[PDB]
Symmetry: none
Subunit: 127 residues, 2 copies
């Protein structure tokens, strides 16, 4: 997968990169720590489902949207992503099963995991 690569970026690193590049950043609106950080960093943002371009360019989704449907949607949007592994924790998936879904991503993406060791493990599951 030449179009996908894995780093270990905290939220501030992801947001800073997304701010500068305008890459699309998926965000699960049920993850309170991320939603709260976004609401504080970009005062006045009206978080809603779908694309919200305000401060950074977000794709807000609910965990009621199944991972494969989310990936289907993101593929159709045809935007480069900065993202965490989709479905990981939010949909009750472990890292390996999140990686299995991410194989269906056809858009370029930077995938951020928790630690440098998780980078190696995730890439192993992905391939």
């Amino acid at each position: 997968f030449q179009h996908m690569g894995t780093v270990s970026w905290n939220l501030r690193e992801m947001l800073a990169h997304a701010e500068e590049t305008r890459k699309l950043m998926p965000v699960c609106v049920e993850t309170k720590a991320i939603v709260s950080t976004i609401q504080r960093k970009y005062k006045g943002i009206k978080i809603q489902e779908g694309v919200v371009d305000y401060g950074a360019r977000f794709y807000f989704y609910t965990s009621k949207t199944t991972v494969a449907s989310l990936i289907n949607t993101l593929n159709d949007l045809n935007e480069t992503l900065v993202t965490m592994p989709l479905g990981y924790v939010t949909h009750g998936l472990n890292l390996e099963e999140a990686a299995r879904y991410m194989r269906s991503l056809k858009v370029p993406a930077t995938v951020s995991v928790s630690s440098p060791d998780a980078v190696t493990a995730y890439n192993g599951y992905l391939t």
Copy 2:
């Protein structure tokens, strides 16, 4: 990041260092000026994707390979690098966002930027 240091070496200085040390030197094949110099200094070289050991030890990549994927691959090769900031200009990244990706390099690397002033800026961004 004790395994990475920043210098200001032009292309000929980078090639001379690579030729003697056999450190792996990533090269973006879309950067015509660099490719033409390599073909001139190392006549007969067969440029193709991946490791090419001819004159110097190169890793040729296309900008269709995402920056994080390239760093994943270079980390897996486990070779010491002589390199420019990956993604800078070639992937539409400024120096700061290139430096952000470079934080994921786990192999030792000498990073060459365009001027001594850029050494200061890059080191500030990297940390």
